[PDB]
Each structure stands twice: as C-alpha cells, then as structure tokens.
Amino acid sequence: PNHPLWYTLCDRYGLYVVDEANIETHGMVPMNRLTDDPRWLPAMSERVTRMVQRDRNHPSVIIWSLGNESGHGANHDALYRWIKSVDPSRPVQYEGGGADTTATDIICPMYARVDEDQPFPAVPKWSIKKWLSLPGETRPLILCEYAHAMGNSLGGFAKYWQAFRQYPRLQGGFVWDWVDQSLIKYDENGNPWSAYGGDFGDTPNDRQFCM
Amino acid sequence: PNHPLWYTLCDRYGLYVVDEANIETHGMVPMNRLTDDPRWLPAMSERVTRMVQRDRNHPSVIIWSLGNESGHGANHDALYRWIKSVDPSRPVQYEGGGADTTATDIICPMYARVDEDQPFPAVPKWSIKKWLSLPGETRPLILCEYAHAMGNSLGGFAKYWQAFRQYPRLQGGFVWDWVDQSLIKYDENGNPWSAYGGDFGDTPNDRQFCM
Ligand code: NA
Ligand code: NA
Ligand code: NA
Ligand code: NA
C-alpha cells in the first residue's frame, strides 16, 4: 500500500490503480513455505484486511492484489475469499504459484512472452496468446509485470501491443517499471553520482538489478 | 456420403472419417435462402437422417457433418439436434454461417489463417489462435478446409503445424484437397491429356479451379 496521497492524486488526475498488500516472501524455499502455513495466516491477514479497510473508498483503486512473489499457499485462498466477501466491487488478483491459480480473477503472469512458451516445471509461463485458450480457461489476461526496462531495453515492446490490440481477452499489462532505484552518493569534491547495489558496502547485493 | 466400401476400408486400414450430408446450396443468395426455409426442411432432413441410418455402425466415422456451404439456417439447427438426439456417440459439425454457429460442436472454419485476421462482415475468418479465446468461446478448432493445394501451392503449411502443436485446442484440419479433378481427353492423334473447366464446351465454367 502506498502513501495515502497517491490514491487522492490518482482519483483526481485519473489513473487506474492496483492496490497491493505488503506481502512478499520471495526468498523462502519453496516460495510458499510461509503462505501455506496457518501460523502465518494472522500476520498475512492484517496486511490484506487493513489495506482494504483503508483504501476501499478510492475510485482509482479498481483491483485488489494479495501481494507479490509468495508462491501460492492456502492462506492466499482464505484471503482471496475474504476480499470477495467484504468487497464484491473489485476483482482480486495474485500472480504467485503460476499466475492462474484459484486465488486470482485475472490471469496475471509476469514476463510471459507473446508467442514464445517458457514451460517451467509447476509454474510455466505460457505464450499469452496460448494461455487464454488453454482447456477450460475463460479469464482475462493482464500481465502484472512485462517489458523489463533495465538499461538499454524494451526490445519487442511493439509485439505486446499488437497482441493486446488483436486479442479481446489480452487486456494489457504493467511495465516493470517506472523509476530506477538508484541512490545519490558524493565524490571527494561533493559531486553527486548515481549508485546501485554494493555501493554502500552492502553485501551480498544484486548490483544494478535495482535499476 | 461416399460409396459404401470407403467406410469399410477406413474401418480396416484406420482413418478417422467426417461423414458429410449431401447438402450444398452455395449458389443461393444469400447462402441460407433454402436452409432457413421450412419448406426445404423435408428434403434436407432426408439427406441427413438417411446418412446417419446407413453409416452409424462404422467405427471410422467419428464426426457427422451437416453439409457444406449452405449458410446457416433454422433447418441446420433442427437437424443438428436430431443427430445429437439419435446418436450421442459422435460430435456434429458444420461450417456454414461463420464456422462457430449453434449448429456445430467444433469451430470448423475454412481457410482461416494462422496469425492473420480476415474480418469479413457477418462471417469473419479470425486468426485460428485468436478464434479459440474469443470471449465465451470454449470449443475445439479443427479446420474443415485449409492449405488450398491448387497448383504450385502449400506455401506456409509449416505455420499451421507449428500452431497445431503449440495450442491444445487447435486440433488440426483437413487439407483442400486430395486429388485434382482433371478429366482425360484425347487429341487428334488419340493421345491422352488432362482437361479442366471449359474443355467440354461447358459454359459458364470455372476453368482450372477444379484442380
Ligand atoms: Na485486447
Ligand atoms: Na529489480
Ligand atoms: Na493442438
Ligand atoms: Na475447387
């Protein structure tokens, strides 16, 4: 959840908002180790429920998200249903556990390609065109993350937009991402420069991957 | 319907058969002028019912077809349901009126392209990949006709097969077609040659389009 003024500005300037719970357990092995554990349901529940209680009156918020990169655990299904029950006005989405689980109203993959399948075990990223028509599948597809804009990037961006326009159920996506997470450091003369991972003696680090 | 021995040979050698009623009204304007007319329902009914009565015991017949290029009329819907009622063991298909009408269990277009849409009014031929995932669509797609093999042709054949293998619900198609409809004629020296439309003083004719 963002600083509260963000939603005010989105209401007034006009931007659709996905409001997302502060839950990410990416570094767990497997990713859902905590989110499938009932011991962690109370902590997770508050991050979902208290977001809804705060932001439910903002017209800019159109979709609730259960968090990010926390696998798919039973705690997600419980909290999916909680939101559906208290606020039927907004779809609920969540990418973890393969982007098309029982905890999401929207097929919301990250970095699924337009034409190319990436058939990873358990959590495949199908071609978005292919994903829509998998047997029994009927949901809209909106990428929660796509076109990773790291350094000299956005090659193939047009391929996404051609597909979005041709396919009714491909309803777009959210580019990753808006702004480089670089930080200002200063040389001996006080001149500023842009710093990334490892520049603060921080270790281990992931270097330029924050930009 | 074919010569009775055909089905016997398909049973024994092993080929899947689409058994198709002897109904084509292509030259009508619009194409469904007779098939939407209840005065023509008796004649149509016999071409469907007497086919089913004859061929229903052949294992090679896996799909019934209501005919070809007769638009989509109320007579098709009636006869679709008749077959569904008398023989639940086989899907019923029919391409007329846009290939995805209420008279077909299978999306069965003719010459719909792999990636390219052809948005004709009333009867569009969508890209086959796109067709599968149109809102509310769930049926399998098998082209009743594709890859028109007229003369020096079958350019782009590989493109269909790549799509068929990638997409579960793209389950193939039937090439148009097996054998040139050329006829032997004899020259002044009694030497045989292959003839097509117009070579018998037949007019109007459609020349080489029979091959
Ligand atoms: Na679209
Ligand atoms: Na990053
Ligand atoms: Na297939
Ligand atoms: Na022909």
Approximately what portion of the residues of chain A adopt beta-strand conformation? 5-15%
Strand order of the largest sheet of chain A: 1-2-3
The number of distinct helices of chain A, counting runs of at least 4 residues, comes to: 5
Compressed to H and E, one letter per element, the order of chain A equals HEHEHEHEHEEE
- Rg calculated over all Cα atoms of chain A: 19 Å
Overall geometric form of chain A: globular
Q: What is the CATH architecture term of chain A?
A: Alpha-Beta Barrel
Helical residue percent band of chain A = 25-40%
In CATH, what is the homologous superfamily of chain A?
Answer: Glycosidases
Reading off the top of the CATH hierarchy, the class of chain A is best stated as Alpha Beta
CATH topology of chain A: TIM Barrel
- Give the ligands present: sodium ion
Largest sheet composition of chain A: 3 strands, parallel
